[PDB]
Amino acid sequence: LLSIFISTWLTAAGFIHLVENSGDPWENFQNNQALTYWECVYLLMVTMSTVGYGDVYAKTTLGRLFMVFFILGGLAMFASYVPEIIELIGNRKKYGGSYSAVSGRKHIVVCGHITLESVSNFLKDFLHKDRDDVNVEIVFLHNISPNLELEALFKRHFTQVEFYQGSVLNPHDLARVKIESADACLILANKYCADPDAEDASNIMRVISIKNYHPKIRIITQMLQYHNKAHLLNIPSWNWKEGDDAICLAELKLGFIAQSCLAQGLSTMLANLFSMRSFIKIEEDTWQKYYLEGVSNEMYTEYLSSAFVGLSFPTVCELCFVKLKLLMIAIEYKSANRESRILINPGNHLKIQEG
């Protein structure tokens, strides 16, 4: 295309140079205008861009006729070649490229079923304002391009959230998002599907692919059916003791409902006990103030000091509540016989061990 453009430019300039310097044959060549060839090239460039300074122009009749034909032909050729220009420009991929690592800033790779609801809830809890200052970026890897509402949602959090188009099952796309340097991979499930077993198998295969690329990465996955998570025990790289976790939606939800059946309001307490809720000061004597006093609590894990060793759990709990203003719920009892097990409020017979 460039060669054709330059060639026609130069030959048109040559025609103009010849006709202007020669002069009109029927007027005894008295119409000659002293134009250099480069001035004719300049004139053609000014004309074809539709600028038209008029500093240099064609004065001969045949030169003006040639200029008219060149204008018409140039417009026709440009109109004909517009589609090839559009093709050469093309449609650039908006969500291509690769994630650029920033020193001192960890990133979390999120994959699976990426739609409005799941991303909205996860970003609402994860990027909450009351969260302590954490320098973590979120990279959503998904083959399906986002719609307008998802694009707007990503624009609202453009400084901390990036989206890339690709598949987890393709190792090249895993290399693009720097999965070998990610802190964790979070797999979201499609809670509204015709076949939950197919979604569970797809999530398990995504886990298999991720652990095949990098066996030391930490994975948190969502599982729909409870009988499928046993498949996660078949992966050799799946280490539960190192932080790999499967959250079973049906099991947890139905267990919450059953525990609320045993004692109503427990689901609300648990949901408020691990969620980041902003605190609002209420001065009017309403139920909202007493509720909001209790919303602010959270769960924490801590190693007991050596001063509590050899003491019963009720005694240690009483000392923590009365003096340390802390409510101790459970202890992780570790034994060489049966590994480690969480005991919820053990009796006075149990004694606190070391660590």
């Binding site: 099952l169 393709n170 190792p171 290399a175 295969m205 298999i208 692919s209 095949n212 690329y213 050799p236």
Partner: protein, 81 residues
């Protein structure tokens, strides 16, 4: 699985549609993610059969038409016309 001693020694053959999934069939593989199909351990050990090799056979049939007949008489068990 486990028996009374483990299922890793059981000889199995797995039909595969996509070649890139073959590295998922092996646990203790040091193969890089860009390793081609014929260099992976599951393919080299014969524990995985990728159907895409049949797509190769067509080309092998074009340059020599006796190869398909030899394969058919060696593989199908002697199916006479």
């Amino acid at each position: 699985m486990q028996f009374d001693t483990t299922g890793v020694n059981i000889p199995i053959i797995t039909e595969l549609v996509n070649d890139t999934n073959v590295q998922f069939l092996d646990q203790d593989d040091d193969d890089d993610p860009d390793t081609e199909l014929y260099l992976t351990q599951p393919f080299a050990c014969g524990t995985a059969f990728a159907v895409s090799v049949l797509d190769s056979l067509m080309s092998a049939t074009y340059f020599n038409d006796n190869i398909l007949t030899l394969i058919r008489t060696l593989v199908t068990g002697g199916a006479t016309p």
